[PDB]
């Protein structure tokens, strides 16, 4: 695997180069359960295509079997979408930047059952990232960790995860942090990944509820990704 031969800077730039673009929604502020989930579904579906191409450019991911790639993506797709969301929403306290032309607050999550709870969780995570002064180089490392770890229950993925850990530490040492500050910051970042997992599972229930209602049309891709969690 070439992923292991990469230097820390090579690993960072590879992840930076693999970064998907910030997409736009269509061009009215959502309040209804239909239009809100309608815009979010359309956006997420287009984001998924970029995520897949992004995953294949993550070092070590391609080295896995196709079925393993499928498993990891099915497990983590909402986690990946969400950490991207809270990252984009960092500079906008109290708001979720789903898209540059789609800023939502918790007041719009009120008009949808069981939504505002997840909204507040996303807002709190975004606020935490802001207070930690999360860097883009750190963010892409965390997102890659999610991809490889979330379904990881293998030796290859293990070493790649260790490699990304070394990459995170490299970035913190590069930023001038002390050894004490490095392992403390590393812990804080990884503990947030537990909350991201929780929000994903809660969001998955919310999507499953929307699917059962059958008003907002789901793409066949989103269906398969969703049904993968149906157990």
């Amino acid at each position: 695997s070439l992923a292991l031969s990469l230097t820390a800077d090579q690993m960072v730039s590879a992840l930076l180069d693999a970064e998907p673009p910030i997409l736009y929604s269509e061009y009215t502020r959502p309040f209804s359960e239909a239009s809100m989930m309608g815009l979010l579904t359309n956006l997420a579906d287009r984001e998924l295509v970029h995520m897949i191409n992004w995953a294949k450019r993550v070092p070590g991911f391609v080295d896995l079997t196709l079925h393993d790639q499928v498993h990891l993506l099915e497990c983590a797709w909402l986690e990946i979408l969400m950490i991207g969301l809270v990252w984009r929403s960092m500079e906008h306290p109290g708001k979720l930047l789903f898209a540059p032309n789609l800023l939502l607050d918790r007041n719009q999550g009120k008009c949808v059952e069981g939504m505002v709870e997840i909204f507040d969780m996303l807002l709190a995570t975004s606020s935490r990232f802001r207070m930690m002064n999360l860097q883009g180089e750190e963010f892409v490392c965390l997102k890659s960790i999610i991809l490889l770890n979330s379904g990881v229950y293998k030796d290859h993925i293990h070493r790649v995860l260790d490699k990304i850990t070394d990459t995170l530490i490299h970035l913190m040492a590069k930023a001038g942090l002390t050894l004490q500050q490095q392992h403390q910051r590393l812990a804080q970042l990884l503990l947030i990944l537990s909350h991201i997992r929780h929000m994903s599972n809660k969001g998955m229930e919310h999507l499953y509820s929307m699917k059962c209602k059958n008003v907002v049309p789901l793409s066949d891709l989103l269906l398969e990704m969703l049904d993968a969690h149906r157990l």
């Binding site: 295509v49 897949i52 294949k56 196709l66 499928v70 993506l73 891709l221 398969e224 990704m225």
Partner: peptide, 11 residues
Amino acid sequence: HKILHRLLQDS
């Protein structure tokens, strides 16, 4: 059988 199979291919 899955769409994800096709998309992950397209080398």
